[PDB]
Structures are given as C-alpha cells and as structure tokens.
Amino acid sequence: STLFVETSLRRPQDKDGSLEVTGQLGEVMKESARIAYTFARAFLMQHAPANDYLVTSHIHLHVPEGATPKDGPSAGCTIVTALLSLAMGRPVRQNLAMTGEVSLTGKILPVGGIKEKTIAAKRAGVTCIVLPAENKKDFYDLAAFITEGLEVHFVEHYREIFDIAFPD
Amino acid sequence: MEMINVSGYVAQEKLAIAERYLVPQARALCGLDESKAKLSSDVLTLLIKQYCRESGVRNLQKQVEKVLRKSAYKIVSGEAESVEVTPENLQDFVGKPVFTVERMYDVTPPGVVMGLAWTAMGGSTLFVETSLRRPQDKDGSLEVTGQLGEVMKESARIAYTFARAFLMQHAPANDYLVTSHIHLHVPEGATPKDGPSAGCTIVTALLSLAMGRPVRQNLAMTGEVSLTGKILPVGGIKEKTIAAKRAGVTCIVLPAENKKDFYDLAAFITEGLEVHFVEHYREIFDIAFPD
Amino acid sequence: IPWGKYSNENLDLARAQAVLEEDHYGMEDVKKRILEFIAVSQLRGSTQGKILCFYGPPGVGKTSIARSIARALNREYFRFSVGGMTDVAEIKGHRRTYVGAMPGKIIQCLKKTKTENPLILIDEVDKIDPSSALLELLDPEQNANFLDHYLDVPVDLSKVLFICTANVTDTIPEPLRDR
Amino acid sequence: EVDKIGRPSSALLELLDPEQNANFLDHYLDVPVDLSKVLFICTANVTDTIPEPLRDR
Numbered sequence: 001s002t003l004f005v006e007t008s009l010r011r012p013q014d015k016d017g018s019l020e021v022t023g024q025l026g027e028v029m030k031e032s033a034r035i036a037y038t039f040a041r042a043f044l045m046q047h048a049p050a051n052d053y054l055v056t057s058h059i060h061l062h063v064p065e066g067a068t069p070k071d072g073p074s075a076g077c078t079i080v081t082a083l084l085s086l087a088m089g090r091p092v093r094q095n096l097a098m099t100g101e102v103s104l105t106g107k108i109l110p111v112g113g114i115k116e117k118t119i120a121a122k123r124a125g126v127t128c129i130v131l132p133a134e135n136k137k138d139f140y141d142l143a144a145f146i147t148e149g150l151e152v153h154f155v156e157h158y159r160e161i162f163d164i165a166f167p168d
Numbered sequence: 169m170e171m172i173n174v175s176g177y178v179a180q181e182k183l184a185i186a187e188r189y190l191v192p193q194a195r196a197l198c199g200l201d202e203s204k205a206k207l208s209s210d211v212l213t214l215l216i217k218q219y220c221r222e223s224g225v226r227n228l229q230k231q232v233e234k235v236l237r238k239s240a241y242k243i244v245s246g247e248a249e250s251v252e253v254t255p256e257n258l259q260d261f262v263g264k265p266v267f268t269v270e271r272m273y274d275v276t277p278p279g280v281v282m283g284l285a286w287t288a289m290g291g292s293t294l295f296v297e298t299s300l301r302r303p304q305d306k307d308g309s310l311e312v313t314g315q316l317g318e319v320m321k322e323s324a325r326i327a328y329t330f331a332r333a334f335l336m337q338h339a340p341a342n343d344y345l346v347t348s349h350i351h352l353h354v355p356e357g358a359t360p361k362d363g364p365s366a367g368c369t370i371v372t373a374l375l376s377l378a379m380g381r382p383v384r385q386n387l388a389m390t391g392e393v394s395l396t397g398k399i400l401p402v403g404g405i406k407e408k409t410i411a412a413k414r415a416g417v418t419c420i421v422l423p424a425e426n427k428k429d430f431y432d433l434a435a436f437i438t439e440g441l442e443v444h445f446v447e448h449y450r451e452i453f454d455i456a457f458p459d
Numbered sequence: 460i461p462w463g464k465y466s467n468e469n470l471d472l473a474r475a476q477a478v479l480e481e482d483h484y485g486m487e488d489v490k491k492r493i494l495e496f497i498a499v500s501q502l503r504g505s506t507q508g509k510i511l512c513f514y515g516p517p518g519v520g521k522t523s524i525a526r527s528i529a530r531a532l533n534r535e536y537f538r539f540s541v542g543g544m545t546d547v548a549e550i551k552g553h554r555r556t557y558v559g560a561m562p563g564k565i566i567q568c569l570k571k572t573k574t575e576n577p578l579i580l581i582d583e584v585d586k587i588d589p590s591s592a593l594l595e596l597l598d599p600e601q602n603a604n605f606l607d608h609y610l611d612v613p614v615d616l617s618k619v620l621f622i623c624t625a626n627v628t629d630t631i632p633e634p635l636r637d638r
Numbered sequence: 639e640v641d642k643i644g645r646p647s648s649a650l651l652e653l654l655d656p657e658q659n660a661n662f663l664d665h666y667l668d669v670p671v672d673l674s675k676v677l678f679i680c681t682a683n684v685t686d687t688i689p690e691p692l693r694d695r
Contacts, residue, residue: 016302016349027315028315028357028358031313031314031315031357032357034311034313034351035313035351035353035357038299038301038311038351038353039299041301041302042299042300045303055302055303072358073357073358101357101358103272103297103353103355104279104297104298104299104313104351104352104353104355105277105279105280105297105299107272107273107355109355109356133268134266134267134268136264137263137264137265137266140263140264141263143485143487145485197499197508198499198502198503199499199502199503199504200502237495237496237498237499238495240495240498240499240502241472241491241494241495241498241499243498243502244472244498244501244502245472245494245498540691542690542691543689543690543691545645558665559663559665586690
C-alpha cells in the first residue's frame with residue numbers, strides 16, 4: 001500500500017521549534033519521526049547554515065488515512081524528505097517513492113516487505129524507487145516483469161537520497 | 169535442574185562444524201556424494217561472513233541445503249555432469265550477499281561509540297548514536313529513543329549525570345553537557361532492548377560528543393556504570409566476546425570483577441583481543457581517548 | 460482397498476517442467492523449488508523425506524500446484540481437509556462396534572483412488588489429540604504400518620506422497636513443523 | 639439456527655454433501671436413502687459462529 005507524509009506550519013514563521021505528530025502512528029513510528037526530525041535539523045544546519053526554518057518554526061506532521069493504525073520504522077527517510085522539502089520550499093521529484101529506516105547520523109537501514117512495496121509502487125504509477133542498499137538481495141530476487149520499468153536507486157546514507165530527490 | 173551452557177561458535181568453529189557435519193548430512197539428504205557435488209572451503213567462508221549473521225549454524229545449514237539442492241537440479245537436468253561451487257560462481261546458487269558489511273560503522277564519528285549486547289538470540293553488537301538537537305548558544309536535556317527499556321533509560325540518565333560530573337572536573341571550561349540539548353539513539357529501533365550494561369558506552373558516547381573527538385576505531389566496551397563512576401560486573405560476556413570477535417574488533421573493555429569469567433573462554437577465541445579490565449571509569453577514559 | 464496396486468511414477472524433469480508450464484503461469488520460484496525437489500527425489504530413488512508445505516495468503520489456490528505436481532508425477536490426486544478438526548476419528552475412523560461406523564478418510568482415499576501411492580493434500584494444516592495422530596501418518600518410521608479403528612488391520616502407506624498447505628508459517632502444531 | 643449447532647455438525651456435513659447424501663444411511667432403516675433430490679435451506683443470526691466446514695458448502 002502507498003502512504004503519503006504531510007507537513008505544514010502551525011504558526012507564522014515571524015525559542016525552540018516543535019513537531020506535532022498525528023495519524024494514529026505507533027510508538028516505533030513516533031520514535032522514527034523524532035529521529036527524523038533531529039536528523040533533518042542537523043542536515044539542514046550543515047547544508048544550509050543560514051536556513052533556520054526547522055529550528056525555529058513549529059511544524060505539524062500528518063500521515064493521511066487516520067482511521068488506520070500505522071507502525072514500523074519504514075517511514076524514516078520519508079519523514080526526513082518531507083521535512084527538508086517543507087523547509088526549503090522545494091517539491092520532491094513528482095513520481096518518486098522511497099522507504100527505509102534512518103539512523104540518528106543518517107545511515108539508511110534495511111526494511112522488510114520489499115516485494116509488496118515494489119508491487120504497490122508499480123501499480124501506483126511510480127517510475128523511480130529508492131531502497132536501502134542492504135535490500136538489494138530482496139529486490140533482485142523479484143521477477144523481471146515486476147521491476148523492469150523502475151529507475152531503482154540503492155543508497156547507504158541519506159546524503160544520496162537528498163541528491164536523488166532534489167536535483168539541481 | 170543443572171545449568172549447562174552451550175555457547176555460540178566463532179567463524180573458525182562454524183567452518184569446522186560445517187565442513188565435517190553440515191555438508192556431509194546435506195549431501196546425504198540430497199542423495200549426492202563428494203565425487204560429483206564438491207563444496208569448497210572458500211564458499212563456506214563467504215556464506216558464514218555474508219549470508220549468515222548468528223551465533224548458531226541454523227542459517228548456514230539452510231544455505232548449504234539450498235546450494236546442494238541447486239547442484240542436484242543442475243546434475244539431474246543434464247546441465248553439468250559434476251558441480252563444484254567457487255566464490256566467482258556462488259551467485260548462481262544463492263542470491264546477492266545478504267550482509268555486505270561486517271559492522272554498521274567503518275569509522276565512528278565523534279557522536280557514536282561501539283558497544284556489545286547479549287540477548288536470547290546470542291551475542292550481538294550495538295552502536296550508541298548521539299547528536300545535538302539544537303544549535304549551541306538554561307538547563308540542558310537528553311532525549312532517548314530506540315525502544316529502550318525502563319532499566320536502560322535509568323542507566324542512560326545515570327550516565328548523563330556522571331558525564332556531566334566528569335566534565336565539571338576534567339575540563340571546567342567545557343560547558344557542553346550542562347547547556348546543550350542532546351538526543352541519544354540506538355539503531356535497530358524496531359528491536360526492543362533493555363539492560364544496564366550499556367552505561368559506560370553511553371558515558372563514552374556523551375563524552376566523545378562533548379569533546380568532539382572520536383573513540384578508538386576498533387574498541388568495544390561493556391559494563392554497568394554507577395553514579396560515582398564505578399564499573400559494575402555484567403553477565404553474558406561469553407556471547408559478547410564471541411560477537412566482538414565476529415564484529416572484527418581488536419580492543420575490548422570489561423569490568424574488573426569479570427576477569428574470572430572472561431578467561432573461561434578457549435585460547436583461540438581471546439588470543440586476538442587487546443583485553444582491558446577496569447575498576448573505575450577514569451581507566452575507560454584513558455583507554456578510549458589515549459591522547 | 461487396492462492391495463499392492465501401484466501406478467508407475469515418472470520422475471523425469473523435462474515432463475514435470477512441461478506440465479508445470481502448461482497449467483501454471485508465472486510463479487517461477489515455486490516451479491524451481493518443485494523441480495529441485497523432483498531432482499532430489501530422483502537421485503534419492505524415492506520421493507519420501509521432507510513433506511512439502513505450500514504456505515501463503517488465503518485464496519491463492521495452492522491446490523492447483525498440488526494438482527499439477529500429481530499430474531506430472533503420474534500420482535493420483537486426493538483432497539484431505541483438516542481445517543478445524545478436533546476428533547482423531549476423522550483421521551483413523553470409528554471403532555467397528557459403533558453404530559454406523561465409518562473408517563478414516565485415509566481408507567476412503569485408498570478406496571476411491573484405487574492405488575497404494577496417491578498424492579494426498581493435507582490442506583489448512585495450520586488450523587488443525589488431532590496433532591498427535593498426524594505425526595503417526597507423516598513419520599516414515601511408523602508410516603509403513605498404519606492401523607485404523609475400523610478395519611483393525613495394518614495397511615502399508617509407505618509410498619504415499621503426502622503434501623500439505625497452510626495459511627501461515629506459524630502453524631499451531633509445533634512437532635509437525637519439523638517434518 | 640445453523641450457527642448455534644454444537645459439535646451434530648458432523649451429521650449436517652454428512653447430510654449436506656451432494657456426493658455423500660446420495661446414499662444417506664440411517665441407524666434405524668439400515669438402508670441408504672437418496673436424499674440428493676431434496677433442497678436444503680439454512681438460516682443463521684450471525685456468520686461468526688457457523689462451523690468452518692459448513693462455510694464452503
């Protein structure tokens with residue numbers, strides 16, 4: 001199944017910033033959201049020191065389909081991408097789908113259920129998919145007719161995901 | 169009942185078990201023999217190092233059975249009269265290497281220090297990651313994530329307090345830990361983990377972040393830490409040392425009271441580790457940061 | 460029951476691969492596993508050993524794979540339901556002294572099939588003491604002499620190729636999972 | 639009230655099977671009766687408690 005991550009401000013940008021997380025997210029997913037927020041703060045500080053969006057503004061993060069409970073750290077890099085895109089005002093590649101855990105230092109870790117996610121992406125019209133490098137064995141075990149049309153990218157650190165999702 | 173321990177196996181022991189038991193049994197199950205189904209020693213080394221990550225040999229048995237089933241299919245199908253497997257053709261029998269790296273970190277940045285853990289699935293290693301949550305310029309703060317248990321959260325609080333006290337006297341001018349907001353995390357957040365053995369590891373991570381200096385690259389440490397800094401003994405160090413050898417470290421730090429339990433290990437296991445025993449955390453500080 | 464009647468099984472890989480290609484599309488991994496199993500059986504000289512367990516989501520039609528395997532191996536097919544079973548007497552039959560006694564479904568399989576080496580699909584084994592009686596059937600150390608409460612005489616089920624399906628790998632019987 | 643039958647369920651399974659009811663044997667008559675021509679209709683309050691072997695028939 002496909003899920004989207006939605007972020008928006010709670011106050012005008014005009015003290016520490018804050019992140020409000022809703023969407024019936026489980027404890028593991030909320031921990032992943034906190035880790036993603038911290039890593040996004042660090043990454044935006046190191047990449048764009050003049051951009052104080054994440055550290056000062058108040059951000060509300062939501063995952064739609066609130067009636068369905070959600071769990072698992074698979075949304076790690078997705079939340080970082082959403083937060084950075086909101087902070088820079090830059091939309092991501094308009095057909096990219098990404099999954100995989102993120103560490104506090106930004107390393108991407110393998111996640112399960114590669115076949116189902118790939119099938120869902122192919123059915124949802126995705127053309128480029130980002131997977132952790134440790135999931136290469138799981139992905140290449142899939143038949144050719146499932147993944148022939150995907151511009152697959154394998155990553156080890158989020159620094160590569162940043163360049164994949166935000167060209168130029 | 170009498171407690172009898174059956175510890176895990178190092179790579180050498182796993183290879184020796186495989187060559188003499190796993191391959192002969194799987195060949196007999198598949199109906200083959202050594203004359204037409206030969207599995208070289210280098211293949212088993214690759215399987216152990218990359219296609220399996222465990223204290224036991226249960227996954228290695230499945231890998232060997234898969235390899236020999238594929239060999240039997242190739243032999244009966246007439247594709248080849250005799251089959252031998254070599255590192256450059258191993259991918260024809262098994263998929264891509266599951267584990268491409270032995271450790272999560274090659275070189276550790278200042279915020280993270282390597283540690284060891286013991287669970288029901290055997291010994292394993294964990295890295296305590298630590299980084300800022302706010303830019304530097306009121307009290308500081310410490311956020312902990314990673315499905316930590318209550319005991320390990322209390323150990324993290326004790327470690328934070330002891331690191332604060334240590335920096336209040338080792339370097340009075342460094343107000344890092346007392347004025348900066350810090351977030352601490354342990355990767356593999358889906359796995360619930362608990363135990364006070366991570367105390368000194370957390371102290372080392374916090375001190376390394378505060379000083380901005382990395383720890384020794386191949387150093388792993390275990391041991392409960394007290395509020396005064398005294399290191400307390402921890403259990404399950406057989407599996408911890410087996411995992412540390414599996415992880416490829418060369419230096420290890422153990423509580424001094426555990427010297428009686430470390431030497432119970434066989435000679436070929438502990439021969440490669442520069443083992444250090446500590447009574448108080450200042451020795452761990454002098455070991456991790458030698459200069 | 461067909462005392463000593465045998466259908467000559469065919470273990471050729473070409474025939475099995477062709478049969479699996481005619482009536483099954485895609486799922487090349489399962490076809491590869493079945494071909495490897497058939498090659499292993501041909502080398503061994505018999506199809507006994509580990510019981511094949513096709514597990515997956517409900518409604519996948521795992522019965523079709525077993526039907527194709529039975530067709531390829533020239534083994535007569537039979538359907539054996541165990542979902543929700545609690546009474547051993549379904550496996551082993553009622554005692555002859557009972558009113559309206561009926562033997563176990565295995566004897567019915569032997570009678571309908573008319574050979575000593577059918578392919579029996581124990582479907583939905585994860586929704587099965589009923590568990591203990593099934594070990595007595597799948598264990599070759601005692602499979603060679605199957606005793607039922609109705610006929611009250613041993614019957615040789617050595618050459619029967621048992622296959623099973625389940626909805627999840629976490630089957631509620633533990634001892635069965637090892638076989 | 640087919641959903642409230644206790645496990646009698648074996649009797650209903652024997653009765654409703656089109657291949658088995660063609661020679662339905664009774665304890666008293668001791669001779670089979672061809673119930674293949676009759677028409678069964680069942681009624682339940684909820685589908686949660688109906689036995690699983692009935693749900694595919």
